[PDB]
Every structure is written in structure tokens, then in C-alpha cells.
Amino acid sequence: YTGSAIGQHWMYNGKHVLIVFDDLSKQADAYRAISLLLRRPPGREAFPG
Amino acid sequence: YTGSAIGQHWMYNGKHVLIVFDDLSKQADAYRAISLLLRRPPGREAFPG
Amino acid sequence: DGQCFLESDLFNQGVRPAINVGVSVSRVGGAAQIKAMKEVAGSLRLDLSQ
Amino acid sequence: XXXXXXXXXXXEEIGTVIDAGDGIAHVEGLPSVMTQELLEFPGGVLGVALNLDEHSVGAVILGEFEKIEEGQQVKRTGEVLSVPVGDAFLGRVVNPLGQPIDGQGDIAAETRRALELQAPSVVQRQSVSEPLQTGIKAIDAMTPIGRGQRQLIIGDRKTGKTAVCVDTILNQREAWLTGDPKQQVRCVYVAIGQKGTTIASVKRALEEGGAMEYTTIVAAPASDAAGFKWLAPYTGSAIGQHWMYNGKHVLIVFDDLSKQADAYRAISLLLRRPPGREAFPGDVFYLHSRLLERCAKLSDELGGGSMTGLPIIETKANDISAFIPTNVISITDGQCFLESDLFNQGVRPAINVGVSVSRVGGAAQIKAMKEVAGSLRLDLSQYRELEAFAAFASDLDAASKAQLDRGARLVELLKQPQYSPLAVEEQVVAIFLGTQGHLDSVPVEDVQRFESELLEHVKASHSDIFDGIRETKKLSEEAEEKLVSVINEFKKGFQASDGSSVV
Amino acid sequence: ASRRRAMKSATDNADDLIKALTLAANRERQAQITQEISEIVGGANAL
Amino acid sequence: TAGRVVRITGPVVDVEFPRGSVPELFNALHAEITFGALAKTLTLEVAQHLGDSLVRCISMQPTDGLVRGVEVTDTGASISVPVGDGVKGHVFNALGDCLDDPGYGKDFEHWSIHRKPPAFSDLEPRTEMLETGLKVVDLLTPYVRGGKIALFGGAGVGKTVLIQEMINRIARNFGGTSVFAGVGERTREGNDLWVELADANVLKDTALVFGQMDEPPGTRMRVALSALTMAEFFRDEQGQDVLLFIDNIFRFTQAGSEVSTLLGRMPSAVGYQPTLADEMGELQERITSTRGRSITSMQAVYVPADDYTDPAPATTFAHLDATTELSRAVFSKGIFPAVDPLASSSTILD
Amino acid sequence: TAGRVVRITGPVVDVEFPRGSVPELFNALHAEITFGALAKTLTLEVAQHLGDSLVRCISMQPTDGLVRGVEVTDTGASISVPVGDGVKGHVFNALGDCLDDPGYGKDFEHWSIHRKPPAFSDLEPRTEMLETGLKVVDLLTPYVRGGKIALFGGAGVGKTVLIQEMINRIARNFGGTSVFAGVGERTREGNDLWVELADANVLKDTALVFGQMDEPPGTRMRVALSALTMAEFFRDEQGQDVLLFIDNIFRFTQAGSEVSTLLGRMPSAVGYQPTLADEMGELQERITSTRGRSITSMQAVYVPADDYTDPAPATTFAHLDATTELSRAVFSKGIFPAVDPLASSSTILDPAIVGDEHYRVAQEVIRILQRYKDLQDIIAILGIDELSEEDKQLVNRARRIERFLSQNMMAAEQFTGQPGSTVPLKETIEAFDKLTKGEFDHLPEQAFFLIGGLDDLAKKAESL
Amino acid sequence: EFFRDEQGQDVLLFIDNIFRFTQAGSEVSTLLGRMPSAVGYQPTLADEMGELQERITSTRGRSITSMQAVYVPADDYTDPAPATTFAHLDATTELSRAVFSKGIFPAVDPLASSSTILD
Amino acid sequence: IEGAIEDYVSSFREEIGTVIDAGDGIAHVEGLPSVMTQELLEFPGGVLGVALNLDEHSVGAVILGEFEKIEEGQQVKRTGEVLSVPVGDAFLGRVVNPLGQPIDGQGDIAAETRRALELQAPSVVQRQSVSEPLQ
Ligand SMILES: Nc1ncnc2c1ncn2[C@@H]1O[C@H](COP(=O)(O)OP(=O)(O)OP(=O)(O)O)[C@@H](O)[C@H]1O
Ligand SMILES: Nc1ncnc2c1ncn2[C@@H]1O[C@H](COP(=O)(O)OP(=O)(O)O)[C@@H](O)[C@H]1O
Ligand SMILES: [Mg+2]
Ligand SMILES: [Mg+2]
């Protein structure tokens, strides 16, 4: 999300930006961890709803 | 159940009846929904016991 | 008591209705058939299995 | 001033069951109870205090949980989870609590030992360098078991696992009759989830063979509550450890360890712990390892004792790659996979010579067997693959055919009947017959008879063969020449069930 | 004749392959059901 | 001293009792359903103690029409079923109430269905073969006295004929009696069985206990223990060899799993109860021979998806000693009793 | 003033402290058990704060005998392990207690096991190849001097044989100082190793920390940190180059799951703890070769049910530079060390580092074995004869290449009796180039098993 | 529905993609307090989806031609969402990845796709 | 003391309950001590419920169709009968909802009798063997 924000600043200022996410499965895992520590009931494959 | 109830009156009076249930899988799904909303404990395939 | 199985592969192959006669069964059996039907259909299941 | 006021304010315990369900209970009171303390209830029932909360104590009930109900008084035994132990257990069948189930009489226990006592550390242990003779040709020849070793007996339903372990227990009688504790192995047979009739059959077989002089049975039959099945291995190891640290040699059989996994699954799910793979709780590994690491050979600074473990595991359709099989394979020092596909053909014991391994290896094998048999494993594996190939060879070279016949006759040699353990002094000769090729003229269908007769020949005359082997554990040439002479002399007197003589 | 022999061998190999695949598929069925039930019950025990 | 219904959730009922009079678990309680169209006397089996004198129970009959606050009277014993010679020739439900003649058997001796298997000292130390007198059975797949024989088949392969035959066999060659546990059986099929055994006149030597599918899982679970209790009485007190039919044990397991789910116990593997193995053992280990008399069992056993690794068949087949499979390909040849000699197997053939 | 126990659930213990004296996280606390021969002093590690001056702790020893209400004293610091050049030659546990000499190390400098990983700015990637003398490793999965290597596999496929073999290949000659962390492996192997390192006289230059299976999960997870502390001390203070063997690192995550289920945290997927990747990362990132110094680590990773998709191995794959992967199937073929050539990988197998002659041969071998593994589905049914000639010529030498990757390791001498073999890189490149080009296609497959180099290949073939 | 009822001018209603409806429902379910069902959808799925689908119907004398796209999770045509949606439709043009990988485009599966008017 | 509590409790002719909760097709109604399992409850907007759950505090009632009209505080009256449907020959050729109400709009239905939905099935002794075809 911070990467996307640093990108969007240049984007809306009229620049052309390229964003590589390496890799979003780790973000899904981190979000799963955070949601499970907050004790949200998980959905399918233990991922957050 | 109401189809069977309508049939049983003919049955006990000496008639011959034919009952088609189309289809009971959605009967089971509806009962699963009703049960889960009542916080009854689920089992295999999320169906109640 | 008895299960009649309808399978899509037979449906596409041309067998319609798609009764898989080789797996559908009835525990009641011949008791539900009239004698004229027993005189005929008896060998049908064996013929289709062969 | 504050301290004195606090002291002034501060200036046989019995609890009550508030909740009870399906083999577990919750108890009020008992502020001074220790964790895993053996509580007792009015009905003559015991319990293990697993969880101690701020207001109540969680107790797993051992035995008949039917007799428990709300409002019952519970009292301390003052003993951490423990079993009575001593030499008096030899020849008795006891439940996991150390109580006698055979009705043969009371138990003159020496002391009490806790179950959760930690295994001996790296510095206390010694190398497995001492033979635990099993008496099965297919095992002592290719997969020797050393004292302090853990050898898995993994296999399929109805494949002779219990039979093999009973043979291993029976073989030790020839040693028991000697008074020296260094040879005097003693045994424990822990039955988990077995049918009562099977335990009775084992009891009978051991009595008939004289094994009950030195064997203890711990019975957790399928009928009893999950808690008994869960404790049975631990109480068996507790009975064994008391002998082990005193300098005795112990042999533990677990028959079968997968049902302890199932019982702990039940207990954990009743406590509502979140399950893992195969619905097992995450700590089944700490169950089977906590059990099997107790087995060791101690250093002479601690008594030269040892305890050997033969865990049995039942595999679903020979899927050795399942969870519990791979967990126990990761714990034990080897496995002897008993394949059912061979058992039904007649290869009994059905040891899969390809997958079986002894990760201690030839270190615990006597020099005689080590020399005579050490080639057999790879020769039989290559024979098995050669047979798999030649099964559809229209024609093949004479050398392949000769190797094929040698392999077939070796396979026919390895098998032996139930409850017929062979002493090593006889096993070495039985394997000599095959490896050195003296069977090359006997038809397959007679081989098993031939060997079984020759061992009696050498038993009545020329005993100096067995004696020379036994007294030095190596097969000297001065004995090998007499052996070959006796073999050739017998070949002329022996005859097959059909056809010609055997040369 | 060699066609006969080789096709018998292939039939036997296919039989053993069917056996192994069926075993693996049944293990996958059981594992799938167990994972689904564990997920449902974890959701239930969360509430 | 009487209790009150405080919660109702499906077949599950919670009952509050006075502080001191909490009943022992597995005790049978009786309650009333007073609505005319559904008038009943409801039987409840105590499953758990929840505290505050609340008791968790499962109903043996439909709870429909049940009202909160209604009186519940403890019987002071487990579910009890009648035992005696007069039990022969009659049809019972799991609760021991007769279906052929309402009110029959009330004066009979009643035995608790929840009783322990034989002690270790009483078991026979070795497996004796049963000479039933059928060629294929005796030769290819010998049966064990006091063992368990799985039976496979269905319609058109001579199953019920085999059942009548084994009943005659036990009643004429060994002087025993038969017990038939219709665990989760079709009502139509149960009437068919009743009329068939009556036409053959073997009913006079058979005790029938039908736990129907129409009724909640608790009854489908306890029917097997009721039948086994009648068999135990015939074994111990009358001194007769007995042959117990169980059709079908997989539905015993299924009912156990369903009751486990209703009670809120977390499921195990593919979805059976956690106590699966112990719950099956408490039945099977009870089928054994003691002190010279035996309860042999024939058990029809379903296999879901025809995989023998599923915990239900995997658990069942650990306890049973023989396997008889009936084949339509043998029946169609005129080969009766159609036992397949190659598919069938036995572990005493040694 | 001090705290009191108020809850016990297995090794996890909740302790209440005065209003303002709550201990920080990962602080060590001492408690007493006084039943009898079971008596001992328990070390608890603070894992959580539950509010109302209550904290939740992980016991490093079995809680059996711990009664409620007993007092608990805060040490004010994390679990501390001894560090220094005197650590070498002796055996330790997770708590810094020497097993060979109980009082040893009490007077040494003590370091906290909990430390933050090195700053990103001080990291630099390594590329120098390490020559082990194993054909498959040196060809297809070249290790890195100062990188992270791992051995994966299921149960009973060669973790211990290959790990002690690599000990012989590296530690027997490595000029630096070695550390061996036994994380949840069997104790008998630890004793065998303690004896062997003395027989070979290497012991005096290596430190051993053991946390074997019998120990409860709480210490079973901290043993790795305990040994890593000594390794990174030898790295940062003495400036020596270090070898850090760890076996088995999967048991660290397994103990994490065990303690997680007790701490009350919700389960993730198949039943591991949440933050699995976070704990494993906090462990692994500390094992890195900062600029100007190096710590070569070889790890063993268990894989339950041979399910390489299990979250724990799938997570640990991300931290490794070289990944040798064992397989059940290759083990059944009689191949040893049973490495899967197509699954294993190494990041430095690129022409800029290993050279063109090495890369071309490795990739041609991979291509041949991949075509073979694709034809397997037909091979299993119709045999080799159905294949066309371009496929049959390939399969014939594919089988030979596969079998030639086997080697008679030094460690296996104790089981097979055959002596061990070491081969230089150039000879392996030459041999596999010849094989792919077909200069040995006329020899039978059985000739290739467990040879070693080319001269031994000729010697063996001559005998058949 | 306004165009249908109040004007009677026939109308084409396109929806892309109507799986995200029940998806959002499943996303909010666990927070609302509903216990999760099978693979992880809300228990109300069938009725929540029906209350929508039954409104798109063409009452007599006033037509709506509906064209709705449905996502199939994990290509699993067994998933409860597609399995429930299948009942509300007269014609289903079931695409499949197996066909798309062969370069066949628009990639309709000729065998699974079905229509009620093919009489 | 028990006497005064009992007097106050009894001072609270047929009972009426109140919805304490509603959502997603379910309603929790407090009160109705004498309600029975699966009784038809009728809410003020004309909608009906089944009362499938009976807790210590409140009844859990599934709502038939017109769920939107339910609100907290609404008076819940009870019908004195478990689920029942009309029956008769007049149903031949009609389309009816599960409660026997006409949904085809052809007109009312000349009900002939009423039967509960959950009556006992014919037992083993009442039945006869199947011997007649259903062609
Ligand atoms: N040495 C043997 N030779 C031939 N057959 C044997 C031998 N040992 C056992 N069997 C066969 O196996 C049966 C007993 O096997 P055993 O009880 O050891 O199996 P198991 O692995 O214990 O199975 P389970 O654990 O289910 O009891 C015998 O009745 C016999 O048929
Ligand atoms: N080259 C080889 N030849 C013969 N046996 C081998 C060879 N390599 C390994 N093994 C066998 O594999 C076993 C390895 O077990 P191990 O790696 O410790 O399994 P785990 O680590 O899963 O417990 C050893 O017992 C050894 O006998
Ligand atoms: Mg056995
Ligand atoms: Mg290892």
C-alpha cells in the first residue's frame, strides 16, 4: 500500500510509474496472521474473509 | 413435509399417491442455513447433525 | 429402496434418458413388475451386461 | 507496619465435580493440587489433573468415567502421575494404573515411578553395540536389532506383526535361564486397543513357551476409555525404566502405537484443542517421541542397562507415507516393513527386504552372522528385481537363471513358522546353507524341511558346531570343515517329497 | 504372440496404476473433508 | 425431586434437577408431550453434566410438541430392555417396547444395555472353529465361534435366505437362538423380514429388535446395544449359543457421529466422532465367548466410496475375523448360497 | 516483591505480578517444583501480557509438579547463553548448562539469545562456490561459501547420513569454528556425533548445543536461538568464519505450533501457528554473512507425509540460497544420496559465477531428465519399446545419467562397507558432458550405481 | 424493473460479475455474526441470491433479457456459488480453461454448456 | 421472600412475547414460557414463525418469508397448534405454498381437513409388502 502511494503521487503529478509486487502471497499470509491474531473468524483456507 | 402431509390424507383414505421431491439437496441446504443461523453446531459438509 | 442414476456422459453419447442401467438398482425388484414383463425383461439385464 | 497487618490478615483438602462429560471432568477447590496429580473420585476411579485454571481444575478420567457425576467429592493422592514398579511385576497382567487385571493376586510393588521423567541426556548414553536376538531369520540376518535400539514393525492389517514380536519375546528364554543380568533380558508387552481375545492368546502363547517368567503385559483393551489407551505406553516404559536404571536389559513392545495416537486425538478433541493434519493434535510427535526417547543404552557410569523398543504401527493400505508412519519413522532407528502382498503368497514373516533398514546396521551383529549373511540383503533385492524382469522374458542367459533359482531358494529359506524362534547358533547355519550354495541341488518345495531337519542332525551329533559358534560368536574354519562334511553326509541320506535324491 | 505377452503386461501395469491412483484419490478425499470440517469448526469456535 | 426442561434444541434437551438429585449419566428420564396430535411419553438419555445441576440429554423420540418447564422424572437406571425366553418371536424397539403387541414384556426381567464386557480371566484363550455345516463356509472361509463375520451383498444375491439358513443352523445343530438387530433399517424391509421369518416359522427362535431410520440417531445408536444385551442374557443365564445379526453397523457409526455433533463435540478425521474406536469397541469386544458359551455375530458392513481406509470400515474390520461376500455372478448360475469362494476370506484358515 | 502462578496448562504458565512490576517480554523467570525426585527449578519465558498485571510464559522445562500459588521471581533479562573461545569443545543445552561439565561456563560472558538481525546496510550477497565433492550437489546445486544451504526430505530418506557426510566434507577441513544445533532430532544421533567428533579430533574446534525430542516445545524452539547466539558471537566479535549446522529446523516451527495452541492463538491453515513466517524469518535472517565476515549454514528440513506443499517447508524455502531436495521415489530406486535433480536448486548456478562449461552441462542434464520425467507416464504402462527413437535414445542415457548422480559417500561406509569417494568438479563436468554426448551409452545401467569418478566407472564396468 | 413495469419497453439487463454479490456477502458474514457454512460462504447464500435472481424475471407482456457473467472459484464448478446459480438460468455458456489453453476462442465448452430452448 | 417474587412473576389472558433480536431471517422472542417446539408464532405484521429453538432466555423462531417487517419490541402472539396444513381433494390441479395457501390466483381452496406436518409414520405392524406396479 505504501508502494502504491509512492506510485500514485508521481502518477497524479503526471508521471508514468511501474510497480512490482514481490510477492503478494506473502501479503496474503501476513494479512492472515494479523487477522487471526485479532481473532477474526477466518474464511476458506484459513484466509481472512 | 407439507407435500407429504397433503398426500397422507389421500393415502389413509385408501387412495394411491405419488410424491416427487425436486429436489431435496436444496431442502438440505435450506435446513443448513436455518440451523447455522440459530448457532446450532455444524458437522460434516457444514450440515447439522 | 432403489437408486436410478443419471449420468451426463451417457446423456451426450445418445442414451436418453441417461439411466446407467448397469449401476441402477431396486431392492424391490420383480415384485413390482407384472407377469407379462417378467416373461420378457428377465434376460435384458444379462444381455446388457455382456 | 503494613507487613504485620498483612500477616495478621493472612492468619486433607477436598474438591467437588462441577462438570463432567465423556471422559473428562472439571473440579472445584483443590488450591494446593499439583499439575498432573493423580486425583481420586468416590467411585474408585482416578484422574489426571491436566489443566489448572484460576477457578477449576481439568481432570482426564482414567477407567470407568460412567461412575462420575456432578457433586462428587474428589481427593488428592499426593502423587504426581506415577505407577508402582518393581521386580514383582514379572509374570503379571496389569492395567495402565499398575493395578492387576488378571485376578491372579495383589502386586508386591517395590516403589513408585513418575511417567513424565525425562529421558537420559546425550552425555549419559552409550552406543548401541549389543545384540538383541529376535530369532527371526529374516530380521537377524539383514536387519539386526541392538539393545537400546528402536525398531519399527510397521505393516498392514493381518501381517504377522504381533506374531513377530511374540517370537522376539519368546527367543529370550534361552538367555533368561542364565543368572547373569548382562544376558538376562526381560520384557514388557504393552497392548493398546487390541481385542481382549488377542491379549489372552498372547498370554497363553507366552505361558506355553515359558516367556511369562520374565514378561509383563500392560493391557489397554479396546473396551476401556481413551485414557487407558493413552497411558499404556507410558506406564509400560515406566515399568521398564526401573529395571533399566538398575542395570537390567529390557525389551518393550508397543502393539500398536497408532491407537495411542487415536486415543490422544479423542482426548484432545474432547478438550476442544484445535486439530492439525489428519485431525491429529499438533503434539502427537511429542507423544511418540516422549515415549520412544526413553529407550536407550546407559553408560557404565550410570549402570550399563538398556531398554529396547519395538513399536508396531498399522498402515492404511500400505501407505507408508502417511502422517503417523512418517512421524514414527522419523523417531525410531529403523523399520522392518511387513508387506501384505508377500504375506498372502506365503512369505512369512513378510519382511520387505528392500524397504527395511537398520540404521544402526552391522554394529550390533555377531561376527559369525555378520560374515555369513552380510551379503544376503543386496543379493535378495537384486533377485527380486531380476524376477520382476524375467517374469516376461521369453529367453534369458544361464547366469540370470542361476541367480534367479538361488534367489528363489534363499527366499524359501528365510521363511519360518510361527512361535518357532531359532537361536543364533542355528540361524548362522541356516543361512550358511543358502549363502554358500549347499542348497543348489535341493528342490524349492523341500528346502524348508531340509534346513529344519539338518539343525536337528547337527543337534544330535557334531554339537561342536553350535558350541563352537556360541562360545566364540565367530565361525572358525576348524568348525566349517566339519559343517561341510556333515552337510554332504546328510545330502545322501535326505530325500525329496517327489523325484530323485538331492545329491 | 509377443503382442499378446506385452499387452498382458500392459494390462497388469494399468491395473496396478488404477489401484495406486484410487488409493491416492481416497486419501485426498479424506484429507479434503477433514480440512473442510476443521475450517468450519474453527469458524464456529471463533464465535 | 422431579426436574424441569430448561432448554430444547432439536433432539437435545437440557434438564435442571434439585441440587442433590442429579441423575447419573446414561440414566433414562421420562417426560410428557401433551399436545393431542403429538401426544407422547418422551425418553431422554443423560449425556453430560453441565453444572448448575443442568443435565444434557438426547431424546430417543421426536421432541416436537415439547414444552419448556415440563416435569422430568428420573427412572434411576440406564435404558433397560426385557430379557427372557418369551422375548423370542417378538419385535422390539431399542427401548425394549414391543411393536407386534403393545404392552408385551412389561413383567419381564429388565437388563441395562450399558454393561461391561467379560473380565480378562473369563475369555477363551484360543479361537475354536464353528462347524456350521455349509460346505463353502466350512472349507473356504471357516467361521470362528464367538467371532465376527462381515457379510456383503444386497438384493437378488440370497442374503435373507442366508439369514434364515443360519438361524435354522444355530437352532437345530447347536440348540441356540438368534437375535436380529435392525440398526438403521428400512421399515418396509423390516416388515418384509418379519413376514418372511414368520412364513418360514423360524421366528419362534429369533428375537427381533428394529431401530428404524424414522427415529432420531440416539435410538439408531442404542438398538445394537439392546440386541447385544438380549444376546448376553441368552448366553449367560440360559446357557445357549447365540447368533447376533447386525444390519447395518455403518449406521451405528453414523448415528454415533451425528449424536456427537449434536452434543457439540469437535469432529475427528473425515468426520466421525472422536471416540469412534472406543465407541465401536464397547460393542464388539462384548461379542465374545466365555465359560463355554458364545455369541457369534454376522455383521453387514457398508463401505463408503468402497475405500477400506475410511475410519469407519477401517475400525470395523479390525474387530472382525471373517468375511463372506455374496455375488450376483454366482447367484445367476444357480449356485446357492451364492457365497463367492475367492472374494470371501477368513483369518482362521491356518 | 514477586509474582505468583495462577494458571497452568501444560508447559504454558500464567503469572500475576504486582501492579507496577510486570516483566518485559522474553524475560526469564524462575519457579520452584518441590514434589520429590521430580523437583527442579523451572525457567519460564514471557510470551504475552494478558492485562491486569498478568503475563503468560512458556516453560523451558516440564511443568509436572508445579502447584498454583508458588512465587515467581523475575531475572530482568532474557535467557542468556555463554559465549567465548572457551565454548569450543563442550556440549550445551538451551539454557547454557553444560552437559559434559555441569559447572562449566557459569563464569563466561553471557549473551541474550534474543537479538535483532543485522542492519540491511551491512548485508552483502555471496557468490563464491563451495566444492563438496558430491557429483549431484557440485553439478546441479552448487553450494555457496557463506550462504544458506538446506536439505529437505521426508522421513527415512537420508537427512543424517548426508548431514554427517557434509560435516566430513566441510567441517573436517574448514579452517574456522563450527557450531552444531540439534533442534529436535533424536538424542542417539547426538551421542553418535559427540563420539565421532572426538574420534576425528574435530571436537576441540566446534561447539554443540542440543535440544533433543524429549524436551518440551518451549525449549525445543529456543535451542536454535541459543546456538545461533554463539555462532553470531564467533562471527561479530572474534571475526572468525563459522559453520552453523542445524538439524532439524522444521521442529522449531512444530514446537512453535505446539506452544501456539496453548497460548490460545487461533490456528491458521492445516494447524500451524499464525506468524509462522514471522517466527521463521526472525530466526533465519539472523543467520547471514554480513560484510567482511561469513557464517555458512546447512539446515535440515523435515517434510511430513512427503507433502512438499505443507506451509512450513513452503515458508522456509524463501530464506535459502541452496536447496537440496530428497525424495521417496528416488530412494526406492536404490539411488543414494537420493537427491531429486529437478526439484533441487541453487541461486549461483549461472554462467557468470560457475562458467559456461558447467552451466551448459547442468542445463543439458536437466533437459534430459525432464524429458524422461515427462515420458514416465507412458514408460510405466507400455515400457520403453513404444517410444520413438529420438525419445528412446534419450531415455537410455537419461537412466544412466540419473544413476550416475549416485555416489558412495564416506558416511555410508559404516553400513555398506564400501569406502567413500571424493571427486573434483572438473572430473564431474567431464563425466556428465561425456554422458550427455553418449560416450558411455554402451555400458549397462547397473555399472553406474554408487561409483564415484570415471576411473572407478571403468574399473567397475570391466568387472561386469 | 422500472423500465419493465412502468413503461413496458423491452430491455436488456447485463450484469458483470454477479458472483461478487455473494462474495461480498461472504466477506461481511463473519463480521455480522453468522457462522460460516461449507467451503466458506455465508449460510444465507441460497436465499440471499434468490431474492435477487427472482426479480430479473420477465413477467407476461413485459420482457427483460438478462445476460449475467458468473465467476467460478478455482475453476471448481462444484463450488456452492455456481452450483446455486445454475438453477436460475435458461441458458449457460460455460467457458473452461482447458479449451482456452488450446487456443479455441471464445472457448465455450461444447459439452457442459446447455440451453432449455434446445427442444 | 420467595412468595413476593412468585407473586410478581405470576402477576404478569394468554401470554404475549416480545422480539429482542432479529436478523437474516431469524428472530429471538423473549417470554412465551408455555411455547412448544415448532409452534406457529404470528407477529404483528401478519408474518409467521416456527419457533424451532427454545433457550432459557428466548425462543429462536425462523420467519416465513416477509422478514423485513420484523422489528425489536414487536408483540408476538402464539397460535395454539404445531405446524399444520389443510388437506382435501380441492388441492387437485392447484399450486400451493408450503402452508396450503393458493399461489396460482385461481381462487380460494375448499379445504376439507387439517393435518400436522410432523405426524407419526405407519409402523412395521401397519404396513404391507409392495406388490403393485407404479408404471
Ligand atoms: N510365522 C507365521 N507364519 C505363518 N503365518 C503366520 C505367522 N504368524 C502369524 N501368522 C498368521 O497371522 C495370524 C496372526 O497374525 P498377527 O496377530 O501377528 O497379526 P497382527 O499384525 O497382530 O494383526 P492385528 O494387529 O490386527 O492383530 C495367524 O493366525 C496366522 O494366520
Ligand atoms: N548411500 C546409502 N547407502 C545405503 N543406505 C543409506 C545411504 N544413504 C542413507 N542410507 C540410509 O538412510 C538412513 C537415513 O536416515 P535419516 O536420514 O536419519 O532419516 P531421518 O533424518 O528422516 O530420521 C540411514 O539409516 C541409512 O542406513
Ligand atoms: Mg496384532
Ligand atoms: Mg536424520
Q: What is the CATH number of the domain that holds I77?
A: 2.40.30.20
H37 reaches E (C-beta below 8 A): yes
CA distances from H105 to G24, H96, H100, H114 (A): 63, 10, 6, 18
Quote the CA–CA distance of A33 and G266 in Å, as a whole number: 9
Residue positions counted in chain H = 119
The reply to whether omega before D325 is within 30° of 0 (cis) is: no
F104 and F165 co-located in one domain: yes
Last residue of a domain, one of G347, G365, G385: G347
In three-state secondary structure terms, D310 is strand
Specify the residue for cell string 554462467.
Answer: G351
Residues 6+ apart with CB under 8 A from D318: D156, D339, D340, D341
Quote the CA–CA distance of I115 and I130 in Å, as a whole number: 26
Quote the CA–CA distance of D66 and D22 in Å, as a whole number: 8
G378 and G258 co-located in one domain: no
Answer whether D368's CB lies under 8 Å from D469's CB.
yes
Quote the CA–CA distance of D495 and D453 in Å, as a whole number: 11
F64 and F122 co-located in one domain: no
Which one-letter DSSP state was computed for residue I62?
E
G251 and G330 co-located in one domain: yes
G284 and G309 co-located in one domain: yes
C-alpha count within 13 angstroms, C-beta hemisphere, residue F88: 17
Contact G186 D333 (CB under 8 A): yes
G6 and G110 co-located in one domain: no
Q: Cell triple for residue D69?
A: 457425576
Quote the CA–CA distance of G371 and G392 in Å, as a whole number: 11
CA H40 to chain centre: 18
Residues 6+ apart with CB under 8 A from D18: D26, D27, D28, D56, D70, F51
Residue positions counted in chain C = 50
Q: How many CB pairs under 8 A join B and H?
A: 29
G184 and G308 co-located in one domain: yes
| Touching subunits for chain E (3+ Cβ pairs under 8 A) | A, B, D, F, G, H
The reply to whether omega before A23 is within 30° of 0 (cis) is: yes
Residue positions counted in chain B = 49
Quote the CA–CA distance of H108 and H97 in Å, as a whole number: 9
D69 reaches F (C-beta below 8 A): yes
Residues 6+ apart with CB under 8 A from G80: G28, G96, G110, G111, G112, G113
F41 and F102 co-located in one domain: no
Is G416 close to ligand 2, i.e. is its CB under 6 Å away? yes
Q: Cell triple for residue D124?
A: 549419559
Residues 6+ apart with CB under 8 A from F3: F15, F16, F17, F18, F21, F29, F55, F71, F72, F73, F74
Is G158 close to ligand 2, i.e. is its CB under 6 Å away? yes
Residues 6+ apart with CB under 8 A from B18: I134
Is D330 close to ligand 2, i.e. is its CB under 6 Å away? yes
Answer whether E45's CB lies under 8 Å from A39's CB.
no
Residues 6+ apart with CB under 8 A from E11: none
**β-pair partners for F51:** F54
CA distances from D193 to D196, D224, D415 (A): 9, 8, 29
Residues 6+ apart with CB under 8 A from F302: F248, F250, F251, F313
CA distances from D452 to D415, D426, F195 (A): 11, 10, 60
C-alpha count within 13 angstroms, C-beta hemisphere, residue B11: 14
Quote the CA–CA distance of D222 and D219 in Å, as a whole number: 9
Quote the CA–CA distance of F337 and F341 in Å, as a whole number: 11
List the one residue out of F29, G156, C22, F269 whose CA is nearest residue D359.
G156
Quote the CA–CA distance of F187 and F182 in Å, as a whole number: 10
C-alpha count within 13 angstroms, C-beta hemisphere, residue G146: 16
F98 and F246 co-located in one domain: yes
Ligand 1, atom 9, lies closest to the CA of D160
Is D195 close to ligand 2, i.e. is its CB under 6 Å away? no
Q: Cell triple for residue F110?
A: 429388565
Quote the CA–CA distance of G8 and D54 in Å, as a whole number: 9
Quote the CA–CA distance of F122 and D334 in Å, as a whole number: 38
Residues 6+ apart with CB under 8 A from D222: D193, D194, D195, D196, F277, F278, F280, F281, F284, F285, F319
User: Alpha-carbon torsion F266, F269, F272, F277, what sign?
Assistant: negative
Crossing angle for the helix pair D477-493 and D464-472, to the nearest 10 degrees: 150
Query: Structural domain of residue I49, as residue ranges?
Result: 1-84
Answer whether G30's CB lies under 8 Å from G73's CB.
yes
Of all residues in chain D, the one with the smallest CA distance to F282 is: D223
CA F77 to chain centre: 19
Which one-letter DSSP state was computed for residue D119?
P
Left, alpha or beta for G422 (phi > 0: left; psi -120 to 50: alpha)? beta
List the one residue out of G21, G16, G96 whose CA is nearest residue G57.
G16
CA distances from G154 to C46, D152, G190 (A): 50, 16, 20
F158 and F180 co-located in one domain: yes
Query: Structural domain of residue G436, as residue ranges?
Result: 349-464
C-alpha count within 13 angstroms, C-beta hemisphere, residue D227: 22
Answer whether D34's CB lies under 8 Å from D49's CB.
yes
Q: Cell triple for residue I54?
A: 427454545
Identify the residue among C1, C3, C25, C27 best suited for mutation to test binding to F, counting F beta carbons within 10 A and taking the highest.
C27
List the one residue out of F144, F204, F146, F217 whose CA is nearest residue F177.
F204
Quote the CA–CA distance of I126 and H40 in Å, as a whole number: 45
For the beta carbon of residue F123, count every other beta carbon within 10 angstroms: 24
Answer whether I35's CB lies under 8 Å from I84's CB.
no
- Which chain I residues are Cβ-neighbours of H32 within 8 angstroms? 23-24
User: Alpha-carbon torsion C38, C39, C41, C43, what sign?
Assistant: positive
Breaks in chain E after residues, C-to-N cutoff 2.5 Å: none
List the one residue out of G184, E39, D278, G420 whose CA is nearest residue B44.
E39
In three-state secondary structure terms, G36 is coil
Which technique was the structure solved with, according to the deposited record? cryo-EM
List the one residue out of H91, H95, H69 whose CA is nearest residue H81.
H69
Q: Cell triple for residue I100?
A: 396450503
User: Alpha-carbon torsion D192, D198, D200, D201, what sign?
Assistant: negative
In three-state secondary structure terms, D500 is coil
Specify the residue for cell string 492404511.
Answer: D316
Burial of residue B26 (CB within 10 Å: 0-12, 13-18, 19+) is middle
G138 and G156 co-located in one domain: yes
Quote the CA–CA distance of D109 and G304 in Å, as a whole number: 42
Number of domains in chain G: 3
Quote the CA–CA distance of F41 and F44 in Å, as a whole number: 10
Is G156 close to ligand 2, i.e. is its CB under 6 Å away? yes
* Residue ranges with strand state E in F70-228: 71-78, 80-83, 91-92, 109-112, 129-130, 143-144, 148-152, 177-185, 206-212
Helix, strand and coil content of chain D, in percent to the nearest 5, comes to 40, 20, 40
- Which chain G residues are Cβ-neighbours of E35 within 8 angstroms? 270
C-alpha distance from B45 to closest chain H C-alpha (Å): 6
Q: Which of D137, D206, D255, D418 to mutate to test the pocket of ligand 1 (most atoms within 8 A of CB)?
A: D418
Q: Cell triple for residue D73?
A: 467429592
| Touching subunits for chain H (3+ Cβ pairs under 8 A) | A, B, E, I
Quote the CA–CA distance of D444 and G152 in Å, as a whole number: 45
Quote the CA–CA distance of D493 and I85 in Å, as a whole number: 95
Element (H, E) at F28: strand F27-33
Q: Which of D293, D359, D377, D381 to mutate to test the pocket of ligand 2 (most atoms within 8 A of CB)?
A: D359
| CA R_g for chain D | 27
Q: How do beta strands G71-78 and G27-33 pair?
A: antiparallel
| CA R_g for chain G | 25
G267 and G163 co-located in one domain: yes
Q: What are phi and psi for residue D286, nearest 5 degrees? A: -70, -10
In three-state secondary structure terms, D473 is coil
Q: CA torsion D358→D359→D364→D366, rounded to 10°?
A: 50
Q: Cell triple for residue F62?
A: 421426536
List the one residue out of G176, G184, G182, G187 whose CA is nearest residue G88.
G176
